[PDB]
């Protein structure tokens, strides 16, 4: 290895971080592929990052939000519920803590678990307003791949946030349990159940 | 080498200097240690009970090392914080002046901080050497 020690020494673990790209210091971005070809080119996993805290220029135009790391999007969507506005230093702390539980329990790469979960909880069909003129009326339409990822992330965040409301379990394990259960496609997930509701509603009003 | 108080993390150094202040309590112990609230903004006395005076002394001395001159009001402003004024919104409130005064005078008695020109206090010549010797210790404790 490269044992270079400067005048100000750095721990060997940080020196190890220079071999591969950032890697969240413990978790491979590579060997992580989105199973669905529909969500390819919209779930950014190729570009690696040390941390999920960047001041990107993502909201100026339409589609630079697609060119954003998926892990960073999870931290942004975990920053909601009113009083928890800002405090991005916190948001990455649960993400780091939750991401660890995905490694201690269900021992695969947690980044892989994240990407397959969002591809398995993104609605494929949805209903829309068409009331036109006459009280109400629904009508089913399709969902774009970008909206599939956005809806998938939103459902996972709100489900763990609600399940952590007035409960001993912290948001770290609640996020971990929600993502793991959605990863394997189990019915106990709030996001999976919500996807069933939207798809069934669209199927009935087809 | 060339280690010093700036070559150390804050938490480890303050605890280490608190460790090398409790083992021999040479500095002082005020009579009202267990009844102060550290400020009019804080609602409860510190839960350290037995200590918390050499912990503040460790923090004050480390703060003195990186600076040149401070005052008791400066320590009050630094060690203060927001106060929950009931339904009214929070507001910055200075710390307890007597507590910082007793700490600052206590650091003078041992010989770690003394008065300086242009007003205020300053780290002592014996104070600088022992505080730097602390840094040479806390790094090698983990080594």
């Amino acid at each position: 290895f490269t044992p270079v020690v400067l005048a100000t020494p750095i721990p060997e673990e940080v020196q190890q971080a220079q071999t591969e790209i950032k890697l969240f210091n413990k978790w491979s971005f590579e060997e992580v592929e989105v199973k669905d070809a529909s969500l390819v080119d919209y779930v950014q996993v190729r570009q690696p990052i040390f941390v999920a805290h960047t001041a990107g220029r993502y909201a100026n135009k339409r589609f630079r939000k697609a060119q954003c790391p998926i892990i960073e999007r999870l931290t942004n969507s975990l920053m909601m519920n009113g009083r928890n506005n800002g405090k991005k230093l916190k948001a990455v702390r649960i993400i780091k803590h939750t991401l660890d539980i995905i490694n201690v329990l269900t021992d695969q790469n947690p980044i892989q678990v994240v990407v397959d979960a969002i591809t398995n909880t993104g609605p494929r069909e949805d209903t829309t307003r068409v009331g036109g003129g006459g009280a109400a009326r629904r009508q089913a339409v399709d969902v774009s791949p970008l909206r599939r990822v956005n809806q998938a992330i939103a459902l996972l965040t709100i489900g763990a946030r609600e399940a952590a409301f007035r409960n001993i379990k912290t948001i770290a394990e609640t996020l971990a349990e929600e993502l793991i259960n959605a990863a394997k496609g189990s019915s106990t997930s709030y996001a999976i159940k919500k996807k069933d509701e939207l798809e069934r509603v669209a199927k009935s009003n087809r | 080498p060339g280690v010093s108080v700036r070559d150390v993390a804050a938490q480890d150094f303050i605890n280490a200097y608190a460790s090398f202040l409790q083992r021999q309590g040479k500095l002082e112990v005020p009579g009202y240690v267990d009844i102060v609230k550290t400020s009019s903004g804080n609602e409860m006395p510190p839960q350290d009970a037995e200590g918390w005076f050499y912990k503040r002394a460790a923090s004050v001395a480390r703060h003195i090392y990186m600076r040149k001159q401070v005052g008791v009001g400066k320590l009050n402003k630094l060690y203060g914080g927001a106060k929950s004024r009931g339904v009214r919104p929070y507001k910055h409130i200075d710390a307890s002046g007597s507590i910082n005064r007793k700490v600052l005078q206590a650091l003078e008695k041992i010989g770690i901080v003394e008065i300086s020109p242009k007003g205020g206090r300053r780290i002592s010549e014996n104070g600088q050497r022992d505080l730097d010797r602390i840094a040479a210790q806390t790094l090698e404790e983990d080594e």
């Binding site: 702390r93 660890d100 539980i101 201690v104 329990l105 001993i168 379990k169 912290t170 770290a172 394990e173 | -």
Partner: protein
């Protein structure tokens, strides 16, 4: 007046506040089977109150089995060290 909201918690199953013996044998033989262990895990499955997991989580970390994968602010993540 009217509230349009519910007012009930559940049924507080208050449990151990001081560690006893009949569950001291329980903990030493039951947590070493936890692939993931933390403060909340034995609060739910082992049914332990507030100021006993933190001591118990400090218990085995200093003594034996479970190991500090990631112990940090408000989250002590430990595995089934074997």
């Amino acid at each position: 007046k009217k509230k349009w909201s519910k007012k009930s918690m559940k049924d507080r199953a208050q449990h151990a506040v001081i560690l006893d013996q009949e569950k001291y044998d329980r903990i030493l033989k039951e947590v070493p089977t936890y692939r993931y262990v933390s403060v909340s895990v034995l609060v739910d499955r082992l049914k332990i109150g507030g100021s006993l997991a933190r001591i118990a989580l400090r218990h085995l970390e200093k003594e034996g089995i479970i190991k500090p994968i990631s112990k940090h602010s408000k989250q002590a993540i430990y595995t089934r060290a074997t």
